[PDB]
Every structure is written in structure tokens, then in C-alpha cells.
Amino acid sequence: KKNIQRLTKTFLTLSLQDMASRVQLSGPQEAEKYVLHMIEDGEIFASINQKDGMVSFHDN
Amino acid sequence: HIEELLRNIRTQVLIKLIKPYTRIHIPFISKELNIDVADVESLLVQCILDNTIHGRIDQVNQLLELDHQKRGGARYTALDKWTNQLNSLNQAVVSKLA
Amino acid sequence: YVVENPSLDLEQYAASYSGLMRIERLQFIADHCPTLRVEALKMALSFVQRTFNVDMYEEIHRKLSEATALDTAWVEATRKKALLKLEKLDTDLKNYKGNSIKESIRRGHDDLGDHYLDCGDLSNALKCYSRARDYCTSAKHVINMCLNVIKVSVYLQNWSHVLSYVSKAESTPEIASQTQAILTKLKCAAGLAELAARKYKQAAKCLLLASFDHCDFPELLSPSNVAIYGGLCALATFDRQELQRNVISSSSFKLFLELEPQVRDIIFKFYESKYASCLKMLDEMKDNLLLDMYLAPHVRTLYTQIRNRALIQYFSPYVSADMHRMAAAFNTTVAALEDELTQLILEGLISARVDSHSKILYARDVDQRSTTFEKSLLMGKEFQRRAKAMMLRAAVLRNQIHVK
Known part of the structure; x- marks a missing residue:
């Protein structure tokens, strides 16, 4: 979760496949579920677009 | 020359x-200055890097955005300074003896 | 430091110097240029045959022999006849000091120090010159002795002492027609000392005040590498508002820049936002630069700081930059540029955000009111926590609770 949060200070829109290569989650689906769990708890401000499989960070 | x-x-x-x-x-x-796009972009970059033109260049849309924003929010910065000082004074009082 | 296979002329390069200093630099080349070993070592042997080398002569000689004999008769000549010469010089130092003539004693100590430098015993020559210090009673005498002490201490690799002596030599005789050779010598020595001291900005500041006409001193450094050092340090540690006043418009440095066209081209292309050519010529100059002493250690850091400065300067005027053109201009792939930008953003030099869907670097504007409010609220919460903590402490320190 700390690594994912640190990812939001540099990136505005990250592909899920690319995202599951710096935090070492080994799979886009696991990264998606982790991001969804983090959003549900209010730790992060992000949105998931399943058309391109991309996570977009709002930070507003 | x-x-x-x-x-x-x-x-x-x-x-x-x-x-x-x-x-x-x-x-x-480019039309006004009778030069092509590349020379206009180079001139704008050189002028901005010399702190002469207060603006920025949007390369995606080929636009130049000026600086008719950033009102006088100096009050805010002053408050920031105050906050910092307050924090320092805090460390002086709590850790004096006990 | 090894396996660099560069190309560099050694005849004119070594011909620009005089004395044992040349040999030193040649040794450095032998340490860092595996392809030029035979010729460089042969030229070093030819140069050192003229000098009075004793230990390091055999050093380089057996090194070249192992890489691939010696005129042993002149080695006997060196030892026994040069020790007879040492007996003669000692004897006439006693003769001169018997009359206690200050100039005579200074000249004797100077000759002894020069002979010790030629024989490689400059360590004892340093103590001899510190002894001769007490016999200096004139302003020019002191200036000359500090210049000589700085010279011999350069061979010792003690830059702090050299800098201290430079400062005292500038400050003692109320600094300042007269020949500017002394001023250029002290400024160049201070610049070299500061460059070896991991302080590039001060070295560039104090080295830019040299004159080509007064730069006549083939014993410390040639004007070519002086210009190279000045240009690299200015390009790496001077901002844009300071590079134009002192490196671009300064008429004193035009002669140095004209001597070396390539560094002038690098500086001018960097100043004109032409980064591809500048980086390419920097890359092709790295091979030559790796063979320079007083430089080989601090080259990677200088290049890294130049590249980071170029990256920041390119993005300074833009608000939304396409990374395809950025990667093309920097002679790199998009992934490497993305990684470098991420590192720069995490470090805290560029306030920007990367969009990988369209590969676009957007500028980030900070909302001053929001961050002000957030900082104030955080400070208030921290202060409340600290106040409650100390109040509990006061409650517990009054009842004598000490865990006996």
C-alpha cells in the first residue's frame, strides 16, 4: 500500500500491467483488487477504467 | 550583425x-511574425527561459498560455511562515523540562 | 577506471609541460589506457632518463618490463656521483649559513628543494622549505616561498593545506603594471585544489578570472585543460542567469574558448536548447576526458548533474510536453526517459505528472490555499497531541514515579 501510494506522486494514469511491475504484485487482477480495496478504505483517490485497464489518480 | x-x-x-x-x-x-512554426516555438522557448515573457507553451495543442492568473495570495504565504514559527516555539515549550 | 580503449595524442600533450609533473601524468595514462601502454611507457622512460629519478624510475621500468635492460652504468652514476653532489650541496649550505646571509641561505634551500624534487624526495623538501620560511624577510620573498610550497604540496596530494597556503598568500601582503603570473598561478592552484575538494562552484568562480596572455606556466596545467575544467564546471554548477554573465559575455574567456572549439560548441549548444548534439559531443568527449588526472574520479557525477540540468531546463518553459519528442531529443528510449523523470520527480526537482496512456508529461500546479490549510490543521493536531503528552508527563513526574 505504501508503494502504491508513492506511485501516485509521479503518475497521473498508469496501466495495470505496468503497475504490477514496480510493486511486484504479479498480476493485473491482483493489482486491481488491491487498488479497489485501497479506494474502499479512503486511503487513495483513484478510478479504474476497465476498457484500457488503466488507473487514473485524481488527488482532489 | x-x-x-x-x-x-x-x-x-x-x-x-x-x-x-x-x-x-x-x-x-507564426502568421504575424512571417516565420514558420518551428522558429516561433524556438523564439518563445528562448524568451521564456530568459524570464522575459510570463507564460508557458502547451505542446500538445500548440498553444501559448499567458499568466493572467495567480492573484495576490501573499496573505497565505505569511500564514505559512507563522505556522512554521509556531511549530518551532512548540518544541521549545513542551521539551523545556517536562 | 580500466578498459576504456580511447584515442589521444601524446606528443603535443606531453610537450606542453616540463619536469617530473609530465612523468606523473604519463603514469596516470599508463594506469588508464591499456592500448597505449608501450608507447606511453617508452616516452615516459625517455623523459625520465633526463631527470634524477631513483625509486620511481625503477618502478616504471620494471612495470614496462612486466608489461612486455636498464642502463645500469648510469644508475651507478646516479647513486654514487649524485650522492657526491648531495655531499657538495650540504657542504655549501653549511658554508653559506656560516656567514648567515639570508639570501644565500634561501638560495641554498631552494636548490636543495629543486634537487629533492628531481630525485623524488620532495617530502623532505617540504620540511626544508618550511625551514627556509623563517629566512624570508621580504614581500616578494614570501610570495615566492608560498608559490614554491604550493607547488611542492600539489605533488603531495594535500589540498586543504594548499588552499590554506593560497588564502594566506593572498591575505598576508595586502593582496595588491606588475606581472599577473603570480595572480594567475595562485588562482589556478586554488581552482585545482577546490576541484579536488568536491567543490565545483567555487573552483569555477575562482578559475574564470585567468588571462590567456598571462597563462604561461608549463608546470601545473596547460590552458587547454584549464578551459575544459572551467567550461565543464560552469555548465554543471552555474544556473542560466550566471552562465551568460561570466562564461558567455566575459571577454577574458573568449581566448580559452577559441583555443578549444569543442567545449565552446558544447556550451553554446546547451545555451541554445540544442541538447541532442550537445549530449552526443559530450559522449564522444568522455573517452578523452577519462584520461585526464585531477578529473577521472569526478566525471560521472559531473555528467549526471549536466544531464539533470538539461532535463530540467528543457521542461521549464513547457506545460504539457510530449515524451516522444523528449526521448528523440535526448537520444534515448521512452522507457529510460520515463524512469529518469520518475526519479527526478521523486527527488523533488520537477513538479510534473506522467500520463502513460498518451505518453505526456503534464505540469503540476500547487493550490496554495489547500496546502496552507492542510499544513495548519496538521500542526494544530500535532500541538494538541504534544500538549496532552506533556500534561500526562507532569502528572506522572509529580507523584514520584520512576520504576524502582
Whole structure:
């Protein structure tokens, strides 16, 4: 979760496949579920677009 | 020395032209200055890097955005300073003895 | 430091110097240029045959022998006849000091120090010159002795002492027609000392005040590498508002820049936002630069700081930059540029955000009011926590609770 949060200070829109290569989650689906769990708890401000499989960070 | 000229006059025209605008089109400046897009972009970059033109260039849309924003929020910065000082004074009082 | 296979002329390079210093630099080349070993070592042997080398002569000689004999008769000549010469010089130092003539004693100590430098015993020559210090009673005498002490201490690799002596030599005789050779010598020595001291900005500041006409001193450094050092340090540690006043418009440095066209081209292309050519010529100059002493250690850091400065300067005027053109201009792939930008953003030099869907670097504007409010609220919460903590402490320190 700390690594994912640190990812939001540099990136505005990250592909899920690319995202599951710096935090070492080994799979886009696991990264998606982790991001969804983090959003549900209010730790992060992000949105998931399943058309391109991309996570977009709002930070507003 | 003719290369130094044909550049100072263009710079003066560019400064005089973009005064009342907030979002201008680069091809419009190219038409006004009788030069192509690449030279206009290079001139704008050189002018901005010299702290002469208060603006920025949007390369995606080929736009020049001026600086008719950033009102006088100096109050805020003053408050920030105050906050910092307060924090320091805190460390003086709590850790005096106990 | 090894396996660099560069190309560099050694005849004119070594011909620009004089004395044992040349040999030193040649040794450095032998340490860092595996392809030029035979010729460089042969030229070093030819140069050192003229000098009075004793230990390091055999050093380089057996090194070249192992890489691939010696005129042993002149080695006997060196030892026994040069020790006879040492007996003669000692004897006439006693003769001169018997009359206690200050100039005579200074000249004797100077000759002894020069001979010790030629024989490689400059360590004892340093103590001899510190002894001769007490016999200096004139302003020019002191100036000359500090210049000589700085010279011999350069061979010792003690830059702090050299800098201290430079400062005292500038400050003692109320600094300042007269020949500017002394001023250029002290400024160049201070610049070299500061460059070896990991302080590039001060070295560039104090080295830019040299004159080509007064730069006549083939014993410390040639004007070519002086210009190279000045240009690199200015390009790496001077901002844009300071590079134009002192490196671009300064008429004193035009002669140095004209001597070396390539560094002038690098500086001018960097100043004109032409980064591809500048980086390419920097890359092709790295091979030559790796063979320079007083430089080989601090080259990677200098290049890294130049590249980071170029990256920041390119993005300074833009608000939304396409990374395809950025990667093309920097002679790199998009992935490497993305990684470098991420590192720069995490470090805290560029306030920007990367969009990988369209590969676009957007500028980030900070909302001053929001961060002000957030900082104030955080400070208030921290202060409340600290106040409650100390109040509990005061409650517990009054009842004598000490865990006996």
C-alpha cells in the first residue's frame, strides 16, 4: 500500500500491467483488487477504467 | 550583425502582440511574425527561459498560455511562515523540562 | 577506471609541460589506457632518463618490463656521483649559513628543494622549505616561498593545506603594471585544489578570472585543460542567469574558448536548447576526458548533474510536453526517459505528472490555499497531541514515579 501510494506522486494514469511491475504484485487482477480495496478504505483517490485497464489518480 | 537584427524586432513585436491575450495560437503568431512554426516555438522557448515573457507553451495543442492568473495570495504565504514559527516555539515549550 | 580503449595524442600533450609533473601524468595514462601502454611507457622512460629519478624510475621500468635492460652504468652514476653532489650541496649550505646571509641561505634551500624534487624526495623538501620560511624577510620573498610550497604540496596530494597556503598568500601582503603570473598561478592552484575538494562552484568562480596572455606556466596545467575544467564546471554548477554573465559575455574567456572549439560548441549548444548534439559531443568527449588526472574520479557525477540540468531546463518553459519528442531529443528510449523523470520527480526537482496512456508529461500546479490549510490543521493536531503528552508527563513526574 505504501508503494502504491508513492506511485501516485509521479503518475497521473498508469496501466495495470505496468503497475504490477514496480510493486511486484504479479498480476493485473491482483493489482486491481488491491487498488479497489485501497479506494474502499479512503486511503487513495483513484478510478479504474476497465476498457484500457488503466488507473487514473485524481488527488482532489 | 544582421543576425542580431531581424530577431530583436521580432521579439519586440511578439511582446507587444501577446500582451492582451490569455490563450493564443502558435500558428497565429507564426502568421504575424512571417516565420514558420518551428522558429516561433524556438523564439518563445528562448524568451521564456530568459524570464522575459510570463507564460508557458502547451505542446500538445500548440498553444501559448499567458499568466493572467495567480492573484495576490501573499496573505497565505505569511500564514505559512507563522505556522512554521509556531511549530518551532512548540518544541521549545513542551521539551523545556517536562 | 580500466578498459576504456580511447584515442589521444601524446606528443603535443606531453610537450606542453616540463619536469617530473609530465612523468606523473604519463603514469596516470599508463594506469588508464591499456592500448597505449608501450608507447606511453617508452616516452615516459625517455623523459625520465633526463631527470634524477631513483625509486620511481625503477618502478616504471620494471612495470614496462612486466608489461612486455636498464642502463645500469648510469644508475651507478646516479647513486654514487649524485650522492657526491648531495655531499657538495650540504657542504655549501653549511658554508653559506656560516656567514648567515639570508639570501644565500634561501638560495641554498631552494636548490636543495629543486634537487629533492628531481630525485623524488620532495617530502623532505617540504620540511626544508618550511625551514627556509623563517629566512624570508621580504614581500616578494614570501610570495615566492608560498608559490614554491604550493607547488611542492600539489605533488603531495594535500589540498586543504594548499588552499590554506593560497588564502594566506593572498591575505598576508595586502593582496595588491606588475606581472599577473603570480595572480594567475595562485588562482589556478586554488581552482585545482577546490576541484579536488568536491567543490565545483567555487573552483569555477575562482578559475574564470585567468588571462590567456598571462597563462604561461608549463608546470601545473596547460590552458587547454584549464578551459575544459572551467567550461565543464560552469555548465554543471552555474544556473542560466550566471552562465551568460561570466562564461558567455566575459571577454577574458573568449581566448580559452577559441583555443578549444569543442567545449565552446558544447556550451553554446546547451545555451541554445540544442541538447541532442550537445549530449552526443559530450559522449564522444568522455573517452578523452577519462584520461585526464585531477578529473577521472569526478566525471560521472559531473555528467549526471549536466544531464539533470538539461532535463530540467528543457521542461521549464513547457506545460504539457510530449515524451516522444523528449526521448528523440535526448537520444534515448521512452522507457529510460520515463524512469529518469520518475526519479527526478521523486527527488523533488520537477513538479510534473506522467500520463502513460498518451505518453505526456503534464505540469503540476500547487493550490496554495489547500496546502496552507492542510499544513495548519496538521500542526494544530500535532500541538494538541504534544500538549496532552506533556500534561500526562507532569502528572506522572509529580507523584514520584520512576520504576524502582
